[PDB]
């Protein structure tokens, strides 16, 4: 998850031609992460284990 | 048991500005957001900003952008709400309230959760 | 910014059902659930008795409803006692982040 509410902002780059930056951002500033189920990610691992 | 004693009741000339200041009891202010609120006499609850207190980040919807000022001290564990350029609105029972937990993960600072509720100071003008 | 609505002020009867609602925008309504509801007595500070539309807040009794519809939602009280004579807010938060407040109703006697 990317917990953060980006904003795309369009600027004019050159002759009919546009570049998208980031504007502000809506809400508050947090951390993006990813989540794994631990015992099922140590019961996997083990059983890589015994091969 | 929790506590947000507020400070003391002020009237200001209007156009003055003064210091709100907000106190913890019972939890340390960095836990939660601190959303600060009021209510004019016979008007309903108004809703005037939020502090991240750890990154001092604010939020305050269009009609106090520049009029609210915020700040806190953790290791004294206070909040303030520091308003300038006062109105005659401005007679009105600031509230400072907790909101929602602050998680690295999850944005809970938005949303109409309060917890507990300061008591009630008065900013006041003549 | 503030645009939150509910009717100013009406009045329930013992033992019966009375709806007190309040109405917003897609923006802030039906963009999220974020609902909750507030009782305030004067000289006493509020007192959360709603949150998330029907999440159980501390201290309700049964007679509190809660729910949502679209740009509506609503304390569908039912069995209406005398006991809670101060108002009742809605609130909700909008897709610009941040909170708004409707112009409270009076649970009026009753």
């Known amino acids: 998850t990317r917990p953060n509410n980006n904003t795309r902002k369009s600027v004019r780059i050159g002759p009919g031609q546009t570049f998208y930056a980031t504007g502000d951002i809506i809400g508050d500033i947090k951390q993006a992460h990813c989540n794994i189920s631990e015992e099922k990610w140590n019961d996997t691992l083990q059983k890589v284990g015994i091969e | 048991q929790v506590q947000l004693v507020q400070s003391g009741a002020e009237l200001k000339k209007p156009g003055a500005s003064v210091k709100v200041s907000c106190k913890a009891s019972?939890?340390?202010?960095?836990?939660?957001?601190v959303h600060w609120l009021r209510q004019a006499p016979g008007q309903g609850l108004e809703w005037v900003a939020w502090?991240?207190?750890?990154?001092?980040?604010?939020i305050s919807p269009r009609k106090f952008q520049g009029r609210v000022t915020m700040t806190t001290d953790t290791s004294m564990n206070v909040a303030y709400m520091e308003l300038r350029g006062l109105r005659s609105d401005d007679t009105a029972v600031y509230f400072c309230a907790r909101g929602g937990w602050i998680s690295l993960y999850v944005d809970y600072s938005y949303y109409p959760n309060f917890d507990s509720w300061g008591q009630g100071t008065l900013v006041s003008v003549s | 910014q503030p645009v939150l609505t509910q009717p100013a002020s009406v009045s329930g009867s013992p033992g019966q059902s009375i709806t007190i609602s309040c109405t917003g925008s897609?923006?802030?309504?039906?963009?999220?659930?974020?609902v909750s509801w507030y009782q305030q007595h004067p000289g006493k500070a509020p007192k959360l008795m709603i949150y998330?539309?029907?999440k159980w807040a501390s201290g309700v009794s049964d007679r509190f409803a809660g729910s949502k519809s679209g740009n509506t939602a609503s304390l569908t009280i039912s069995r209406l006692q005398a006991e809670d004579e101060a108002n009742y807010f809605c609130?909700?938060?909008?897709?610009?982040?941040?909170?708004?407040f409707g112009g409270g109703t009076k649970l009026t006697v009753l």
């Open positions: 998330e539309v029907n």
């Open positions: 502090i991240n207190p750890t990154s001092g980040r604010t």
């Open positions: 897609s923006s802030d309504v039906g963009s999220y659930n974020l």
């Open positions: 609130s909700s938060s909008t897709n610009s982040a941040t909170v708004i």
């Open positions: 019972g939890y340390t202010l960095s836990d939660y957001y």
